[PDB]
Design a protein around this ligand. Structure first.
Ligand SMILES: *Cc1cc2c(cc1C)nc1c(=O)[nH]c(=O)nc-1n2C[C@H](O)[C@H](O)[C@H](O)COP(=O)(O)OP(=O)(O)OC[C@H]1O[C@@H](n2cnc3c(N)ncnc32)[C@H](O)[C@@H]1O
Ligand SMILES: [Cl-]
Length: 385
């Protein structure tokens, strides 16, 4: 309808955070989303999200995780919406047989993070609702916890809008026109121009980045979570049951304690169906794996939470080949910033990424080390049409 300093396409986890950072600096910003964030068609719903600090996936991750934590605490003080609860996060697995646990312990050591190390019966004794074999070891992070993701996006949106940011909802971006001095987006509701463009369309990045002459392999996955009736005297946040992410023989699982009797929430991380974001079946239970994969874990490790399925949710992961993020400037256009391939573990960093995206869009650089997320890295297999 007119000109803006910056346009953000995809106002979800990353986009809304970037929008808040931009608006706070007085930048005329327009955020465009295919739906009305927060919504249940992308990758940010399901009430809760785990944030961990002892990130062994990469050292560059820890600093970003710590900065994000501080930013989440800042957001908590600015809005009336609930943002974070310090449940702590438990990580366990078979001794000497889990690379996830090992790297977590290494990360904790290298960055001097505060953690408790326990093994075997010690785990079961500290948290009654958990039953693990004696050959299992664990690392507990008391200072990390759970974020209320929908509240996070809602808060960033309200704060951004109060400062002048415009949010155009139910508007799908269909094409881009990039020039060395400006950008333009085309939608069924009209075309818009700006000096800078931030692209953060989540799972849809796999289908539309080609419009920006980018040929990066991105694979969307259907990932479900289930809420189970549980023994509240053992799995409630009120009795200090922690959030968790563990590695067992058949893969990685993550879960949350019951909040206000909502029940324990569990998800299987290593498996999901390869899908197209436009034809994905968003109904939980249509595949036998949806529920069976979850109960298999519960009856073995948390029997007291293997109750009636209270509710399920379908959501998406967007993976890169190396499972590391993509946060960088378009290789050919310095006025286009790309945020994609969060591979199922990016929400906890959304506050920090919002800061990174705003810095890149306004100055072409950022104070954070984002070298591991380069769009030019080999393992990615990036090319142009
Ligand atoms: C799915 C999932 C993910 C997940 C998780 C549990 C489940 C079931 N648990 C996590 C956890 O405990 N800790 C953590 O750190 N991450 C966890 N995740 C992953 C995290 O949720 C995702 O990495 C994150 O949400 C990715 O954010 P991103 O911003 O990429 O994705 P989005 O929030 O879906 O936003 C994309 C938005 O863009 C819009 N869109 C799409 N296409 C268009 C077009 N054409 N035009 C305009 N807007 C568009 C969408 O509407 C969406 O809002
Ligand atoms: Cl993702």
């Amino acid at each position: 309808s007119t000109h803006f300093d910056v346009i953000v396409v995809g106002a979800g986890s990353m986009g809304m955070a970037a929008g808040y950072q931009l608006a706070k600096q007085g930048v005329k910003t327009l955020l465009v989303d295919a739906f009305d964030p927060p919504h249940t068609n992308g990758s940010h719903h399901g009430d809760t999200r785990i944030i961990r600090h002892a990130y062994g996936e990469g050292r560059e991750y820890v600093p970003l995780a710590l900065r994000s934590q501080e930013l989440w605490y800042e957001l908590e003080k600015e809005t009336h919406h609930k943002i974070f609860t310090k449940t702590g996060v438990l990580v366990f697995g078979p001794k000497g047989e889990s690379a996830f646990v090992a790297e977590t312990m290494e990360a904790a050591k290298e960055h001097s993070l505060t953690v408790d190390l326990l093994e075997g019966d010690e785990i079961n004794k500290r948290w009654p609702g958990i039953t693990v074999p004696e050959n299992y070891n664990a690392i507990f992070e008391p200072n990390s916890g759970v974020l209320f993701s929908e509240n996070c996006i809602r808060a960033y949106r309200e704060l951004a809008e109060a400062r002048g940011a415009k949010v155009l909802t139910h508007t799908r971006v269909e094409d881009f026109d990039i020039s060395p001095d400006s950008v333009k987006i085309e939608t069924a509701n009209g075309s818009y121009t700006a000096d800078k463009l931030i692209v953060s369309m989540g799972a849809w990045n796999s289908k539309l980045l080609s419009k920006l002459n980018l040929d990066i392999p991105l694979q969307p996955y259907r990932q479900v979570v289930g809420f189970f009736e549980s023994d509240e005297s053992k799995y409630s946040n009120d009795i200090d049951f922690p959030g968790f992410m563990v590695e067992v023989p058949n893969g990685i699982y993550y879960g949350f304690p019951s909040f206000g009797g909502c029940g324990l929430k569990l998800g299987y991380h290593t498996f999901g169906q390869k899908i197209d974001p436009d034809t994905i079946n968003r109904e939980f239970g249509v595949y036998p794996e949806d529920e069976s994969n979850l109960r298999a874990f519960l009856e073995e490790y948390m029997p007291g939470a293997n109750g009636e399925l209270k509710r399920g949710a379908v959501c998406m992961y967007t993976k890169t080949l190396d499972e590391h993020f993509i946060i960088d400037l378009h290789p050919e256009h310095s006025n286009v910033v790309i945020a994609a391939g969060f591979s199922g573990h990016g929400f906890k960093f959304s506050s920090g990424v919002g800061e990174v995206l705003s810095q890149l869009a306004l100055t072409g650089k950022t104070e954070h080390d984002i070298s591991i997320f380069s769009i030019n890295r080999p393992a990615l297999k990036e090319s142009l049409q």
